[PDB]
A paper describes a structure:
(A) Cryo-EM map of the CBF1:CCAN complex bound to a 30 bp DNA segment of C0N3 containing CDEI, at 3.4 Å. (B) Two subunits of CBF1 interact through their basic α helices with the major groove of the C0N3 DNA at the entry of the CENP-LN-HIKHead-TW channel . Inset: CENP-LN, CENP-IHead, and CENP-TW form a basic, closed chamber that topologically entraps DNA. Specifically, a basic surface on CENP-IHead forms extensive contacts with the DNA-phosphate backbone. This topologically enclosed DNA binding chamber is further stabilized through interactions between an acidic patch on CENP-TW with the CBF1A protomer. One consequence of CBF1 engaging CCAN is that the CENP-LN channel is extended, so a total of 25 bp of DNA interact with CBF1:CCAN. In addition, the CENP-LN channel converts into an enclosed basic chamber that completely surrounds the DNA duplex, a configuration notably reminiscent of how human CCAN grips the linker DNA of an α-satellite-CENP-ANuc. CBF1 then contacts CDEI through basic residues of the bHLH, with His227, Glu231, and Arg235 of both CBF1 basic α helices recognizing bases of the near-palindromic CDEI motif, gtCAC[A/G]TG, in a sequence-specific manner. Notably, CBF1 binds to the CDEI motif in a manner that is identical to E-box (CACGTG) recognition by the metazoan heterodimeric bHLH Myc-Max transcription factor, using the same conserved amino acid triplet. Last, the CBF1 basic helices adopt an asymmetric dimer conformation to accommodate the CCAN structure, most apparent for subunit CBF1A where the N-terminal basic α helix is unwound by nearly three turns to contact CENP-TW.
The point centromere of budding yeast specifies assembly of the large kinetochore complex to mediate chromatid segregation. Kinetochores comprise the centromere-associated inner kinetochore (CCAN) complex and the microtubule-binding outer kinetochore KNL1-MIS12-NDC80 (KMN) network. The budding yeast inner kinetochore also contains the DNA binding centromere-binding factor 1 (CBF1) and CBF3 complexes. The inner kinetochore centromere-associated inner kinetochore (CCAN) complex (14 to 16 subunits) associates with the centromere, generally through specific recognition of CENP-ANuc.
Author numbering:
A (entry chain L): 2 to 242
B (entry chain I): 2 to 13, 25 to 117, 130 to 245
C (entry chain O): 222 to 364
D (entry chain T): 269 to 360
E (entry chain N): 4 to 165, 186 to 309, 315 to 341, 374 to 451
F (entry chain W): 1 to 15, 36 to 89
G (entry chain B): 218 to 251
H (entry chain A): 221 to 251
DNA sequence: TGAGCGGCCTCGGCACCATGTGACTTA
DNA sequence: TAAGTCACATGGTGCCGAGGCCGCTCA
């Protein structure tokens, strides 16, 4: 239950320099981690300019809950119109101090990120593909639940959900064929063919993967302590102009 | 006008009606308001219903409220304690009505916060300490500790919802002063009393009276 | 009554119908050819079996409305299938439970001081039978 | 009836104490303490019937709650509004 | 002797009865007062005609209902209202405000399994029910016919037993249990209650209806629906039962006339105006479309969701509003059972879905029958294209 | 409902300024009894491991308290 | 942390076990007549 | 002293009911 | 100006699945 | 020691009756 709030950044800011100023301001050492991930390793997802820069800023004091574990995750690519976004979990009041310092030090323009319906479908696609230490990608199947809150006159239809079990989801994926985006290619077309609902047009408020994560229109909350690389990448292509 | 402070110096039934109608026509100046509240608080021969009728119908400022008027009012909002017994106790309904009239119109923030610990004043002190807190540096953990201590204190009625409103304003204001939403969780979770506290009525008849008096008052001010 | 073909068995099933619930159209359809129906003859047999019930209720309501129209009986109350009825002949509240075109139960309710109970039972036994016979014998005993 | 208190009176009385210090009361416990308030009031009136200066603080020392008058006007500090505890301090 | 007659006075709170009679209009209060004083009488002294003249003076005085409520609760019957009064006021509240009550249907199965079309002799049924429930609890039952609907609504009220609580000599009432009897229908509507007293009342009702062969009530639906008119439209003995949604045209028969009618006005001669529906997938690809064909696609959605071109008559409101439905669609995609659980919530599910179809969010050419309102207020599993309801 | 309301309850149970102060101190003592009893109830519930308290818990706590008093 | 990583791994194992139980229940319900 | 009809006591009852259903189902199985 | 019905709505009690962790077993 | 099965105790979503204030609202 770690909600991730997403904010975009107008500039490619380099964090390996100047973080000592943040350490002096906050009177505590942060555990900045540098990684260079290549998310679209699939040939159909692109084979060039796939490298990202992943920063994991962490206000490390103690490890009991998110009151002392408000992580910060930054992702960046210099070959894009918008070059950087951040996402941070927890509810500590030092996080907005970190954001204010980031603004006042790098001169960046920061705005909250809202996901569209197709963006949420692509994020649900991204959050099942897991990278393994043997450098392979594994699709872990979760019993999804598309959850809608339509606005109709006289509040005729307040809300309606579409629950899809795990074995039915993998059966739909195997029926479509060998694909790496199951929801956008197999689940959503099956829903459209059966019930007539275009879920990329309907007001979709959340899709819930049971036991793993439940992404919303403005936040992503995950049972897992971190956020995988595919979700970060899909958020990064989401905010492009 | 000179009729107002002439009636004030005369008070040192007909005078009350003349003061009411001249306030409804002209309105008092800041030294006139100072003298009027100084006369009203110190004596007790005037009836309490007439006292609240004065503070709800006669106090009508014309321009800026000076700091001296606030300092004189603060002197009258105190209570007799073990270190001050010579001064008489100002009536609590008069104090509450005066604070309500103040609602109608760094040191001073702590002044109003230390007066917030009064039980009967809590229903009108809270907009003042909300409106005083305009900057993130104004809030501090000692203010939060005092607010939480008086909020969760028993023997109070308006303290939970109103102090939850204060903490909500502080959370919306600073984004710092390490997290206080769990302190809000410790205080009441009914969303009804502070729901009624978050919308407040200011007696729009008196607002229109002050509106017309102030429109009769200074051009381009 | 609308019948759709089953996808896996090639036989009609009771999809939708606009017939009220006092006529067990599902039971009649399941009774037709022992469940499944295939040919148009079985569908027409089910249709005739339920149309006979429609004829029964319409004919019963027609007989009672004609009894009211001839001013033989006073104001009466009809239920939906016109089976449980009650009416006044002069002032006697005669209430009837009637099955298909045949009265199987009768009840004389209103009691007059001149009116007795053995003659009441004899009238109740005599009033049983067909509906046309009831009209004829009621007009006979009215005079 | 007239002498027993109500359940909502106990909510308004001790709701903040069960909130700051985490206490969970089901409805059966609420009815039980509504019953117990009468027994507590009868025991308090049996122990202290009339009220004068020294006997109340001597009884509260015997109650095991306090040890001196300092504990008296510190316990009154955490249970009364500011004007009332100042008035009690002027009384003691 | 444990049966409760129509003259016993129970202990009822005066303020609850005070706020209960506030909702009734003045004319039903007038009719109730004259009927009550004609039947049972009151503590007020006077002739029946004299009391009629007094209430007449009250009604051409134009007095508010509060004064007459205080009168009938403080001088007419100051000791307390009789059980017949307490039942009849609440039944009149049911008549005045039908949307404040939720009902649960139950079919009257019997013997082999054929439904039993229940028929009631009302006075004998009330007597037998009261004698049956008198063996267990202190029961009073009151029965009346709806002024508009062809039903027979009963009201079963059960009474229980009874620091020093001083003395009351009371008989505390519980919430009443209502069971609605349509005239000729196996479906029985009863109030929403799952405690042991509701089970006792339904059990005694099943034992006292039968008298020839044992009858069991099997619940056909677990989601309550408001507004007794709507549940007679859905589950009652009407044409709209088993013809809902796109098939309400058959239940209303607005499309064909008698064969004895003018054949110049036949549908096949005058014709109807329709549009070519594109079977190719073009809904996902796509502004200021022509207002005549826009009216035709609005009519197409209206026809799909309400059965009629003009509807059964804002305009999205269906014949019966539905609160909760849940469909479990199952298919077989290459020897794999693929289940999809669609749950719905709102004030009118199919009206909201019609509005979403009008906003081009749901393809009206691909919206199935069960989603369109067919077999409405029934939640079930769609296997092999056939909808079977849940139990 | 303030402590002065409980003082009003106590005075109407027994039926100037100094007696008002006496009754206010009595109300403070009553609140102290209730707080101590509830603290003992939580202590025994946590000893047994239950998150909430129950009537037998607080009955045992108040019997142990009145045994010492 | 090491123990936190162990707790996360055991959490994932228990989640997989619960999903297997639910899948078996759904299969058994698919074989059911009603 | 068994007035506990809340959580940690009704979830235990539901879990025991599920366990008994699983047990009788496995009892009907040959192995 | 004053009573007054209706959507809102939250309290909270109940119902049920969902969930994370220690204890224990298997390899 | 990594992984698995287990009941267990808490988290949480949905639901609904009670009741309160609101929101005009109309005479």
């Amino acid at each position: 239950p770690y909600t991730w709030k997403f904010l975009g950044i107008s500039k490619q800011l380099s964090l390996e320099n100047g973080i000592a100023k943040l350490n002096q301001l906050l009177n505590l050492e942060v555990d900045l981690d540098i990684q260079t991930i290549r998310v679209p390793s699939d040939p159909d997802g692109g084979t060039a300019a796939d490298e990202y820069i992943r920063y994991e800023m962490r206000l490390d004091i103690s490890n009991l809950d998110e009151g002392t574990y408000s992580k910060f995750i930054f992702l960046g690519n210099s070959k894009m119109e918008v070059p950087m976004f951040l996402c941070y979990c927890g509810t500590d009041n030092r996080n907005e101090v970190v954001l204010q310092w980031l603004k006042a030090e790098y001169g960046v323009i920061m705005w909250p990120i809202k996901f569209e319906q197709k963006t949420m479908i692509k994020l649900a696609d991204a959050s099942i593909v897991h990278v393994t230490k043997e450098n392979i990608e594994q699709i872990t199947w979760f019993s999804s639940k598309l959850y809608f809150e339509p606005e109709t006159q006289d509040k005729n239809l307040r809300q309606f959900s579409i629950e899809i079990p795990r074995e039915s989801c993998e059966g739909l994926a195997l029926g479509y064929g060998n694909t790496m985006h199951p929801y956008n290619d197999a689940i959503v077309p099956y829903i459209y063919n059966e019930t007539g609902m275009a879920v990329e047009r309907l007001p979709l408020t959340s899709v819930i993967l049971a036991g793993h994560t439940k992404i919303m229109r403005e936040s992503i909350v995950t049972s897992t302590r971190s956020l995988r690389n595919r979700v970060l990448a899909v958020v990064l292509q989401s905010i492009q102009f | 006008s000179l009729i107002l402070d002439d009636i004030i110096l005369s008070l040192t039934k007909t005078t009350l009606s003349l003061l009411y109608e001249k306030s409804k026509q002209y309105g008092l100046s800041s030294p006139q308001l100072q003298a009027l509240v100084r006369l009203l608080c110190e004596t007790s021969i005037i009836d309490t219903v007439t006292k609240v009728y004065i503070v709800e119908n006669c106090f009508l400022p014309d321009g800026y409220l000076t700091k001296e008027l606030l300092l004189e009012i603060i002197n009258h909002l105190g209570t007799p304690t073990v270190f001050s017994r010579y001064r008489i106790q100002t009536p609590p309904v008069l104090q509450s009505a005066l604070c309500k009239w103040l609602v109608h119109v760094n040191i001073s923030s702590s002044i109003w916060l230390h007066l917030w610990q009064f039980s009967f004043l809590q229903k009108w002190i809270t907009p003042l300490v909300i409106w005083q807190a305009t900057t993130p540096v104004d809030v501090k953990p000692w203010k939060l500790s005092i607010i939480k201590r008086c909020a969760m204190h028993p023997g109070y009625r308006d303290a939970p919802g109103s102090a939850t409103l204060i903490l909500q304003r502080f959370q919306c204001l600073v984004g710092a002063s390490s997290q206080i939403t769990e302190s809000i969780i410790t205080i009441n979770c009914n969303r009804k009393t502070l729901k009624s506290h978050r919308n407040l009525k200011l007696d729009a008849h008196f607002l229109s009276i002050l509106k017309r008096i102030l429109s009769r008052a200074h051009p381009a001010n | 009554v609308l019948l759709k073909k089953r996808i896996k068995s090639n036989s009609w099933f009771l999809f939708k119908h606009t017939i009220p619930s006092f006529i067990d159209v599902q039971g009649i359809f399941d009774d037709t050819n022992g469940g499944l129906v295939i040919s148009h003859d079985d569908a027409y047999l089910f249709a005739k079996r339920v149309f006979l019930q429609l004829v029964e209720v319409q004919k019963r309501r027609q007989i009672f409305k004609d009894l009211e129209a001839k001013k033989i009986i006073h104001d009466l109350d009809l239920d939906l299938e016109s089976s449980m009825v009650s009416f006044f002949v002069k002032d006697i509240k005669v209430e009837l439970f009637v099955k298909q075109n045949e009265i199987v139960s009768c009840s004389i309710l209103d009691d007059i001081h001149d009116f007795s109970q053995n003659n009441k039972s004899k009238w109740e036994i005599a009033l049983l039978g067909s509906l046309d016979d009831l009209e004829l014998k009621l007009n006979h005993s009215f005079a | 009836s007239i002498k027993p208190l109500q359940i909502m009176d106990l909510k308004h009385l001790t709701r903040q104490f069960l909130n700051e210090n985490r206490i969970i009361l089901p409805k059966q416990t609420w009815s039980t303490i509504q019953e117990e308030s009468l027994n507590i009031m009868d025991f308090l009136k049996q122990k202290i019937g009339t009220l004068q200066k020294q006997e109340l603080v001597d009884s509260f020392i015997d109650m095991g709650i306090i040890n001196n008058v300092d504990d008296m006007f510190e316990l009154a500090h955490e249970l009364l509004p500011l004007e009332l505890q100042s008035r009690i301090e002027s009384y003691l | 002797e444990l049966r409760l007659e129509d003259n016993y006075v129970p202990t009822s709170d005066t303020l609850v009865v005070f706020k209960q009679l506030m909702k009734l209009p003045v004319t039903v209060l007038y009719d109730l007062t004259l009927s009550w004083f004609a039947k049972f009488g009151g503590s007020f002294d006077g002739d029946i005609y004299l009391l009629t003249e007094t209430l007449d003076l009250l009604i051409e005085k134009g007095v508010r209902r509060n004064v007459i409520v205080n009168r009938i609760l403080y001088v007419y019957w100051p000791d307390g209202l009789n059980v017949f009064q307490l039942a009849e006021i609440d039944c009149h509240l049911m008549i005045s405000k039908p949307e404040k009550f939720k009902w649960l249907p139950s079919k009257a199965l019997r013997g082999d399994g054929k439904p039993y079309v229940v028929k009631l002799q009302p006075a004998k049924f009330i007597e037998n029910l009261q004698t049956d429930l008198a063996k267990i609890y202190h029961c009073h039952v009151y029965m009346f016919k709806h002024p508009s609907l062809p039903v027979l609504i009963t009201r079963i009220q059960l009474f229980d037993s009874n620091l020093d609580k001083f003395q009351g000599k009371p008989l505390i009432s519980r919430r009443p249990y209502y069971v609605a009897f349509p005239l000729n229908s196996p479906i029985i509507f009863h109030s929403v209650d799952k405690d042991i007293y509701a089970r006792l009342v339904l059990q005694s009702i099943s034992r006292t209806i039968s008298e020839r062969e044992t009858i069991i009530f099997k619940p056909v639906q677990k989601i309550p629906v408001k507004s007794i008119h709507n549940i007679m439209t859905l589950l009652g003995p009407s044409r709209f039962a088993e013809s809902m949604g796109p098939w309400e045209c058959y239940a209303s028969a607005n499309f064909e006339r008698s064969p004895l009618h003018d054949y110049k006005k036949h549908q096949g001669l005058t014709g109807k105006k329709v549009m070519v529906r594109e079977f190719d997938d073009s809904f996902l690809n796509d502004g200021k479309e022509e207002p005549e064909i826009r009216r035709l696609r609005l009519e197409k959605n209206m026809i799909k969701f309400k059965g009629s071109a003009n509807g059964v008559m804002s305009r999205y409101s269906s014949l019966v509003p539905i609160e909760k439905v849940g469909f479990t669609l199952k298919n077989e995609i290459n020897s794999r059972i693929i289940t999809i659980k669609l749950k719905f919530n709102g004030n009118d599910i199919f009206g909201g879905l019609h509005e979403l179809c009008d906003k081009n969010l749901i393809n009206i050419d691909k919206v199935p029958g069960w989603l369109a309102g067919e077999n409405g207020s029934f939640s079930g599993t769609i296997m092999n294209g056939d909808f079977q309801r849940e139990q | 409902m303030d402590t002065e309301a409980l003082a009003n309850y106590l005075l109407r149970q027994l039926s100037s300024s100094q007696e008002y102060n006496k009754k206010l101190l009595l109300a403070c003592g009553f609140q102290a009894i209730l707080r101590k009893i509830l603290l003992d109830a939580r202590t025994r519930a946590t000893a047994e491991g239950l998150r909430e308290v129950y009537p037998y818990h607080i009955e045992a706590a108040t019997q142990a308290f009145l045994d010492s008093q | 942390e090491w123990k936190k990583q162990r707790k996360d791994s055991h959490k994932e194992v228990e989640r997989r076990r619960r999903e297997n139980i639910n899948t078996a229940i759904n299969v058994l319900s698919d074989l059911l007549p009603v």
